[PDB]
Amino acid sequence: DVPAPLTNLQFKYTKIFINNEWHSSVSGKKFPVFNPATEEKLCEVEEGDKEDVDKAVKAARQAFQIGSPWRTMDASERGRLLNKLADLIERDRLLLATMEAMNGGKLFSNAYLMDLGGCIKTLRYCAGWADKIQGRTIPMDGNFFTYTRSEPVGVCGQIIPWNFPLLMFLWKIGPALSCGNTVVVKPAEQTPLTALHMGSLIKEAGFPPGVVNIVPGYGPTAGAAISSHMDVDKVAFTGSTEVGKLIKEAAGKSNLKRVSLELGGKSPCIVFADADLDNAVEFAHQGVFYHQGQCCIAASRLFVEESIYDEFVRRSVERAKKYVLGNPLTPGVSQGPQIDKEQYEKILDLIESGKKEGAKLECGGGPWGNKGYFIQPTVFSDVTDDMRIAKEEIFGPVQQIMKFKSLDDVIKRANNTFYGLSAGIFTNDIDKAITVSSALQSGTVWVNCYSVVSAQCPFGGFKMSGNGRELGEYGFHEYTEVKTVTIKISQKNS
Amino acid sequence: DVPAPLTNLQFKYTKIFINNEWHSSVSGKKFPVFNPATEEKLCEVEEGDKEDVDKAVKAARQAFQIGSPWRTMDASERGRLLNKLADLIERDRLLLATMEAMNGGKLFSNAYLMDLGGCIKTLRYCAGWADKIQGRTIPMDGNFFTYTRSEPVGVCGQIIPWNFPLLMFLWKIGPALSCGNTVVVKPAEQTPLTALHMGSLIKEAGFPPGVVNIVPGYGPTAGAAISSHMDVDKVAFTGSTEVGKLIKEAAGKSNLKRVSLELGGKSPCIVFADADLDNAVEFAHQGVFYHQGQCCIAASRLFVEESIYDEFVRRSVERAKKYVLGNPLTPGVSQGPQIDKEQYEKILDLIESGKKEGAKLECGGGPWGNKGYFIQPTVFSDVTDDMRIAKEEIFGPVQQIMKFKSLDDVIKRANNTFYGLSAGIFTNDIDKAITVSSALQSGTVWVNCYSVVSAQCPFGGFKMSGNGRELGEYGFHEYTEVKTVTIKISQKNS
Amino acid sequence: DVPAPLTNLQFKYTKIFINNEWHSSVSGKKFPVFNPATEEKLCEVEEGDKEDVDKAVKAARQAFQIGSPWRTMDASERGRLLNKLADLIERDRLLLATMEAMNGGKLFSNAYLMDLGGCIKTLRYCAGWADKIQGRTIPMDGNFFTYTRSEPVGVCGQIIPWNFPLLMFLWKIGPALSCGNTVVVKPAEQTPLTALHMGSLIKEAGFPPGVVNIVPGYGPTAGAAISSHMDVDKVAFTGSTEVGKLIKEAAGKSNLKRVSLELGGKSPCIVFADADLDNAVEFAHQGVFYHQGQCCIAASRLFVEESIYDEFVRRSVERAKKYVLGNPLTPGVSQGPQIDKEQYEKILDLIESGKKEGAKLECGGGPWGNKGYFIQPTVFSDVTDDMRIAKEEIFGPVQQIMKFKSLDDVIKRANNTFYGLSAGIFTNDIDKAITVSSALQSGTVWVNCYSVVSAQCPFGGFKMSGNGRELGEYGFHEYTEVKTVTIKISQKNS
Amino acid sequence: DVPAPLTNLQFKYTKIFINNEWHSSVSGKKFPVFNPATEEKLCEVEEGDKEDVDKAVKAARQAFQIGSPWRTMDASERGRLLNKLADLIERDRLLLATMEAMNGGKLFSNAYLMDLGGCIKTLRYCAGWADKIQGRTIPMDGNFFTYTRSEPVGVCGQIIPWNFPLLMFLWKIGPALSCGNTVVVKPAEQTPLTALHMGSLIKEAGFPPGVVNIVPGYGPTAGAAISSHMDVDKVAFTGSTEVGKLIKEAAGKSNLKRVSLELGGKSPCIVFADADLDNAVEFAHQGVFYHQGQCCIAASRLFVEESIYDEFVRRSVERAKKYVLGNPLTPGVSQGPQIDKEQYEKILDLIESGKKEGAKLECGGGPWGNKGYFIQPTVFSDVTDDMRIAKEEIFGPVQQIMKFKSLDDVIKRANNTFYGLSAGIFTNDIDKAITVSSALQSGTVWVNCYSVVSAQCPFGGFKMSGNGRELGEYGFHEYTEVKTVTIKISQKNS
C-alpha cells in the first residue's frame, strides 16, 4: 500500500552531469522549474546549450573507445550494474515519486505505484538482456567462415518529454546501456529533476564515467545540438510529431545518424455491439483520461456501434463526473493539473473548436480553480471525422465519442490518419478480434483492454506515430549495429 | 483437375538403395507387397535385414566424412538439390499418386491432391531453410571470442509407417538433408514402393551417393538393426507407441543415439454449446474418418456439451452414412480399405468391445464386401471414459461421441490419457479459445477447425504421443548438433 | 562455358511499368540511353517524373490493401513466385547479361558469370525466407495473451544506381516482396534497360498487378518525387552519400517514412608483415579495380606494413599493367569504360589532384582511346591521409598505397573517415584477426580475402556509409513493421 | 580476496524436502555422510527411496497444475525469485563453501571463488531468461492464425553427481525454474549437504511449495525411482556413461519421458608445434588436474606434435611436482583427496594398468598419507591409443601424454572414441584454429585455452558424452515443450 508523500523537499542535483561529475552551464545561465499545481518555483537548474552538449558528447565518445572499461567489461556485468541501479531506485522510491509528483503535476499514488514500479521493472527487464544480445554464424557460399557481431551503435543522443519524465528516462538508458552504448540524455525543460537525481544513482551504482551524461535545457538549443551533432551516432526521441520531423531532417543534414522516434497519436478505440459494456466503458475511460489525458496512447477517438451508442455515451459521461481536482500530493485528489500554460491553452482552444464545430458538449468544457493549470474532465459526443478534436492530438482530459454502423467503414475511419501509435478493440467475437486487429494500422492493438504496456513487449508507432520499436526483444536490436566478419579458410564443412 | 489414374502399373524399383545403386538383399530373400483393396500381389521387394542395414550405415557414414562432397557443399546448394527433387516429384506426380493409391488402399483423388501436394510443399519448405540454419556469437565472460556451429547430427536412421508412406518419407528426409545429415530410411513393410521410386529421383536430382539409403524390410529385423546400431547417431520414428518404447530402450542400451518419436494418439475434440454446429460437425467428422480413420491425429474422442449432444449425434450419424465403399482407384468411391488383415481384425475387435461394454451403436459396425479389408463407417454414442473404444487408438473408421456438462470436467477428461498428440476446440468465445487451448496437454490444438497440418508449423506430441517436433523452425534445430567454440584473445570489446 | 554475347540487340521494354502494363510518360518526354564503350545511343526510354511516380504509388497502395490478392496470398506462394522469377532470369540469362554489358560498360563474362549468377542466387535466397518471417508470443506481465505480427511495412520506394543495375534491382525487390511489401523502383537514368526487361518477367511469373512498379527517369525529378511522397511508407536508396542526405531530409520533411541507405565508401585494406603476400596482392588488387573501380566496397586505401611496403608496391604496379582496354563485349578485353562523362571527369580530376598534392604516380594516370570513357589503370604510392585521393571516393581504376608502422596507428587511420562500408585485414595471426576486426568501424570486415559478398550475409555501412542492413536474416526484418497485439484473458498460465 | 573457512560446522538440514517442508524418510532409515580428507562422519541424512520419490513427484505435479501459483505467476516474477535466491547464496557464501569443501574434498579457496561464484552467476543468467522465453507466430498456408507457446515441460526429475555438488544442483534447477517447470532433485549420496541447505533458501526466497523437491539417497533406489516414474515428464542426468544408459532405457520402458544426459569424457587436447608453449603447458595441466582430476572435461589425452614433444613432457612433469597434499581447508594445501574409496581404487587400478601396459611413469603413481583418499599427481608419457589409460575415464590426477606427426592422423585419433564432451587446440595458425575445431567431434572446442565454462554458452556432449545442451540460449529451449495453436479465421492477411 502507499506511503505519505514527502513535503519539505530539498533539492540537491540541479547541474549538468558529465563524466560522473556535476558542471555549471558553460554560459552560467540557469532556468527555473515550477510545480504546475501551485505555479511555485521548485528550484533553478543549470541551462545546457550547444557547448554543454559538446562536452557531453566528448565524454560519451571517450567512454566508448575500444579498450575502455565500458567496452571491455563483461556483458553480464553491464546486467549486474543495471540491476544495482534498480535497487537504488527501490531505496529512493518515496523521494523519486514525490519529486515526480511535484514537478510533473502527477497524482502521487500513481507516481508511486505505476511510474516507479514501471521504472524498476523496465530496468530489471533490460538487465537480463545484456549478455543475451548475440550475433550469428552463417553458412555462406564458398570456403569462408562468416559470423556477425551485434555491436553497440555507439554514442546515443536521447531526447525525452515531460509526461512520464523518469519512466521515459529509463526506457531510453536501460536498453542503450544493456547493449553497451554510451548516451547523452536531454530531459524536457519542464521536468529535469528526477533525471538529475538519477545521475547521482548512476554514479553510486558504479557505471564508468562518460557512460551516462545528462544535459538539462531547452529544445531548439540543447535538443537541436544533439540532433545536428557530427559525432552522435544515433538519436532517439519521444515527443511531438512536429519536433520529430525536425530531428529526422537534422539527422540527414548532418551525419546521417540513425534515428528512432515515438511521436504521439490519435488512437482509435472501437466498441462493437457484442462487447462486454462494463469492461469497455472503464478501459476506454482510463484509456483517454489517465494522467490528465497526457498519454501518447490516449484513446482519443472512441467509435461505438450505433445500437449501443447512446447508452455508451450516458455511462461515459457519468464516469467522467467522478473526479476531485486539486494538488496531486493531497489525499482524495483524483485529477491533477496539466503540465504548463502552453498545453493548458492548447487544450482550451481545442475544446472551444469542438463547441464551435458542432460537437455535443456532455460535461466539463472549461477551466477550474484559480491557481495551477486545471481543466474540468470533458466529454464530447456526436463527433465527426472532419472536426479538429477528431484529428489533432489534444493531450488533455477530453474524450471524443463517435458512432459507426459498418465494420468496413469503421476500420477505414480508424486508419484514416497520419498517426498510428495504438488502437483498442472491444468484442466477444473471435474472428473480429483477429481480423480487425490485423487490419488496423497501429503498432499496438489491445483486445478487450487498453493501455497495457509491459517491458517484454515491443512498443511504437506505424506511420507518423514513429520509427522503430522500444523494449521487448525487438527494441534491443535497435541499439545494436551489425558487423559481418568473413574469414577465408582452406575448406569449409557443414 | 484430377487426372485419370494409371492402371497396369509396371514396377521397376524393387531393391535396396545404397550409395545411389540398387542391391539385392544379402540373404537373397524377397517379400511380397499387396494391394489391400483387392488382396492381389503387386510385386516382390528385396528383404533388407541387419546385414543390409550395416552396408547402408557404412555408406551414410562415409558420405558424412569431413571433406566429403555433401559436407563441403554450399548450404544453398543443398537447398537447390531439395527443390530439384520437388520438381521431379511434380513430373512424376500421376505415377506416384497411382502407386500410393494401389499400395496403401488410399483414395486416388486424395493421394493426388493432398498427399502429393503435401510432398511437394514439404520439400519446398525444407529447401528454403538449408542456408538459414545459423549459429550464434556469444558475449561470454572473460577475454574470449565464442561462437557456436549448428552442425548436422550425422547418420540418421529413419523408420516410418504405412498410412502416408510418401509424405512421411519426405517429412523425414527433407529436414535431415536440409541440415546436412545423411540418412538410412526404413519404409513400412506394407508400403515400400513409393519410397523406392524416390530413390531413382534422388539419384537423378544429383545427391551424392550415400546421402540417402533406403532399406525395405520388416520391423524387428531391419527396423531393430537401425535402433541398435552402434554407428547411427540419431533415430527418428513414426509409428505405434509400443514400438516407440522399444526404439527408445534400444537407443539407451546401444550407443545413446538421439531419439525423436511421433506415436499416435487419442485426440479429443471438444464442442461447446456456443459453437457453429455445421462447421463443427463436418470438421469433427473428417477429423476422425479421413483415410479410413488411419490418421495419427484422429478426433477419436468427441466431447459434445449436453444441451447440443443429441442434435450433434443425429447430424454425425447422418453424415457417416454418405459413403460409397470400394476400390480407391474407381471414380465415385469415397472410402477405401484398411491397410492389412492385422489392422482389420484389431478394428473389428474394438468395435465388438464397444457393443459389449454398452456403447450405443448408431450405424455401421461390421465388415463389407467379399475381397479386401473394408469396414463400414461406424458411429458409437453414449461412450464413457472407461471403455476400450474411449482409451485405445482404433485406427479405423470408428467415431466415439461423449457428453459433458462442465468446462473443468471436460478439460480433465480430455487430458486423462497417456496420449497427447492433438486436440480440437469448437467455440465462439475468445476466452475459452485461448485458455482452454493453454490447458490442453496436446502438441497441436485446433480452434474451430481440425486436421490443419502445414510445413511451417512444428508438429508432434506431448506425453506418450512423442518426443521432439517435426517441421517448422523448431523441427529443424532437432536435426542439428550444437558445437561451442571458445577462442582466447588478448582483449574483448563489445 | 560462357556463351558468345548477342549483338544487334533489339529493344522492346522502353516504357514505365505500372499495374503490370506499360505506359508512356505523362509528359510524353523520352530520354536517350547510351553504350559507354562506344558513345552510341542504344534506345530512348519514357521519362518518368512526379506525375508518373504518383500513378505508380497509387498502384502500389491499392495492391497492398487488406483483402487484396498480394495481402491474402500464402507466404509460401510469395516464395514460389520469387523462384519462378529466378527461373525466368536463368532462361533469359544471355539476353540480360548482354544487355547489361552494353548499357553498363561492363565486361561481358563478368556480367554473365558474376552479376547474373548473383541475381539468381539472391532471388533463391529471398524466396526461401518468405514463409519463415515469424513473429513472437510473449510472456508479458498480467492476465493477457500477447503476440506480435511481422507485417510488411507497405509501399516501398526503391532508388538504385548504375554500377550493378540488375543485381541492385533484385537486392531491392527480392527481400521487399519476400516480406509482402509492394514497391516503386527508380532505376538509374544511365541504366534502365535490364530493369525494364525485368518488368516483363515479373508479369510473366504471375505477380499481381501493382506489386512491382518501375519508373525510369532522373534523380531530382522521379527520385525526389519518391523520397517526398506522402503515401510512400519507406524509401530504400543505394547511391552517393550526397544524395543519401537529401533522401533522409526529404523523408523527415514529408511523412517520416522509414529510411534505409547504402552509400559508398573509402574502405581500408590493411596488410600486416606476417601475411601471405601473393594472396594479399591479388585480393587487394581485385578489391580496388573490379568493374573499372566502380564498386562501393573498393579497397581504396591500401595500408601496408613498412617492412613489406616496397615489395607490395612493386608487385601491385606489375599487376596493374596486365590489362587490355576496349569494348567489354569483345573477347580478350579485360577492362571496359567508366559509365559516363561526369564520372570520367571526376576521376581525371582526382588523378590530377594526386599528382599535384605529391603522391607518386607508379603507372597509368590518363585517358585512353578515342571513343568511350576509358581511363588507364592507375597506381599511386606514398599516399598520405590528407590527400584528396586518400579521402574522397574516386569510383575509378585508381589504387592508393600507404605505409604504416604501428598497429594502433593504422587502426586509428583506418577509422578516421566519415565512411564505414567495409574493410580488409591480411594476417596469419589469430589474435590480430579477431581483435583488429572488432576494432574496425566498418560493416563488413574481410580476413585474408576481400569482396566476398553473399546473400546469406547482412550487408551495409557504419557511419555515413549507410543506415540499415540488406540481405541475410537481418535485412529481412527491416522490410517488416512490428505489431503487438494484447488480448485480455481471464487467467494466464505459463 | 578469501575469508577463513568456518570450522565448527553444525548441520541443520538433513531431511527430505517436499512442499517446502522437511520430512523423515518413509522407512526411517538414514545414511552417513563423510569428509573424504579425514574419513570422519559429518552427519546422517534421511535415506530417500521410491516411496519418498513418489511423495515428491506428487508435490511437483500439484504445483504444476493449471491455475496454481507457479503456473499463473508472471514470468518476470520467476526471474525476480531466481535473483533473490542468488542474493541468499551471496549471504551464505562462506557457509556454503565451507560445507562444500568439507563434504566434497574440495580446495576451499576454489570452492569459495570458483564454485560459489559460478553458482551465483548461473542463477543471475537464468533469472534473466525467464520472461524472454517466447514462442512464434507463423505465416502458415490457408486462412488460419497460428502461434506457438513455449510451455514448460512439467515435472522434471534431476539426478546429479558429487564433483561439483552445488554448482550442478543450480545448473539443473536454474534453467528448469526459469522456464516454469517443477522439479525433483536427487543429489549424489556422497554429497547431499549443500543441496539440502539450498532447500532452506528456496523456501526463504519465496518459491511456492512443490516447485523444488529434494530427495537424498542412493542411485538404484531414489535415482531409479525417478527414471522409471510414470508421472515424471522429463529426466535430466549428469553422471557416468554406464548409469546414463540405464536412465535412457528406464525412460523408454516406462512413460517415454524426455531425456537429457551429460556423461563425462576422454577429451583430447592437441598442441601443434606452432603454439605458444608456456600458455599451452599451463592450460593443459589445469585442464587435467583441476579438482583432483574430477572434471568431466578433463584434458585426459594430450597430443603433442613430435618436434616439441620431449620438451612438453619435461615441462608438464615439472609442473606436476608443485603440489602440497592435505586437508583442503588448510592454508597452503594445493591438492585435496579423491571423493571416496570406490574412486580411489578405480584410479590406482588404472595407474597400475598404465605401468603394466608399458606407459612411461614420469612422476607420482601411488597413494599418499595415511588418512583420506589421496593420490600423488601422476604423469604418464609415451601413451598409445590401445592402453586403458588412453581409453577409459580415470577421474583422478593422472595425465596422459601422446605424440603425433600428422594433422589428419591426430584428428582421427582425437575422434576415435565413443566419448565427445570437449576438446582443446593450441596453435597460432588461423586456418588450423577454424578447420580443426570444425572437424573435432566434441561439444565444446577451446582454442588456445581450456576449461572455460560460462553461463552464456551451451554445454554438452557429442556421441556418448551426452544428449542435449545445458545453459546458454540453447539449453533453455530444452526445458520447454512446444505447443502449436491454429485458429480458423475468415480471411488471413500478411
Ligand SMILES: NC(=O)C1CC=CN([C@@H]2O[C@H](COP(=O)(O)OP(=O)(O)OC[C@H]3O[C@@H](n4cnc5c(N)ncnc54)[C@H](O)[C@@H]3O)[C@@H](O)[C@H]2O)C1
Ligand atoms: N509522444 C509523446 O509522448 C509526447 C510527449 C510530449 C508532447 N507530445 C505532443 O507534443 C505537444 C507539445 O509538447 P512539447 O513539450 O512542446 O513537445 P516537444 O516535442 O517539443 O518536446 C519533446 C522534447 O523535445 C525537445 N525539443 C523541443 N524542440 C526541439 C528541437 N527543435 N530539437 C530538438 N529537441 C527539441 C523538448 O525540449 C523536449 O525535451 C504536446 O501537446 C503533445 O501533442 C507528445
Ligand SMILES: CCCCCC(=O)N1C[C@@H](C)c2c1cc(O)c1ccccc21
Ligand atoms: C492512457 C491509459 C491509462 C493507463 C494507465 C497507464 O499505465 N498508462 C497510460 C499511458 C499514459 C501510459 C501508461 C503507462 C506507461 O507505462 C506508459 C509508457 C509509455 C507511454 C504511455 C504510458
Ligand SMILES: [Mg+2]
Ligand atoms: Mg514543442
Ligand SMILES: [Mg+2]
Ligand atoms: Mg507392429
Ligand SMILES: [Mg+2]
Ligand atoms: Mg548525382
Ligand SMILES: [Mg+2]
Ligand atoms: Mg555409479
